[PDB]
Amino acid sequence: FEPLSDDIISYINEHPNAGWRAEKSNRFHSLDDARIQMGARREEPDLRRTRRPTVDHNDWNVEIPSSFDSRKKWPRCKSIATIRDQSRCGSSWAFGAVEAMSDRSCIQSGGKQNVELSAVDLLSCCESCGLGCEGGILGPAWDYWVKEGIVTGSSKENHAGCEPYPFPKCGSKIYKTPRCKQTCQKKYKTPYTQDKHRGKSSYNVKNDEKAIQKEIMKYGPVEAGFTVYEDFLNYKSGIYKHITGETLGGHAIRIIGWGVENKAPYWLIANSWNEDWGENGYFRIVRGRDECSIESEVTAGRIN
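The chain above was modelled as a monomer; its predicted structure follows.
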């Protein structure tokens, strides 16, 4: 099937037991449109393995609930329910990171901190993280948060904090990574170096369902990567699994919990294509099967 065609949509909607529903995309008009709006690549297996530890929470013998929603456990951390838009910049690697990091800053401090970390700062300033708007790597984003820190910064539309996103929420423009500045916006009086929020640790989470589950419910939303196939471009609702189409590359998102619908287990994930995309900004995807490698590259860290 041609991607984003009436025909691929029809195939999906007539497919027995797809588990999800396709709709004409309101964001992508070509394969090119979507290629630019992603931005994750697997970390080299050895480097990933040797740069930070791998947590499994084996030694924590807790009951895992059949469903969990970070928004429910920590309702007063507003960032958890905040959906961002990456624009036409392949920076989902940075977005996934700063989102979960903002979550955890609130969660792991009992709400004493409540902050929006600047996407542009991580994607512009992190050299070891990859190619900025041309795609990136999860692990080094978190190592960076620890070593260097990330400043405050809202969406373009909000104009808040040190470095708000310089690209607007959804033309044909292809955004080039901005140069790393170490200055805030004129109006934001707190100086850049002071404005740095640092993590105390970063780690891989074992490619293991239970391990990912324990990590989220205790420490908050995690970042993860997955492979996007052509059918994903027309996902609107339901529990995604790959049915047809080939790889378009990798994408990084934020897993905020999980559950089960009509006997089918899923992860609940915030995407970075604004609140009009998918299920009010979120999407669900098969859990426990390593679907599209969603469970392969989970990445996080803590502030204490």
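The beta strands are 20-22, 54-55, 68-69, 201-205, 222-229, 235-240, 247-261, 264-270, 282-286, 299-302.
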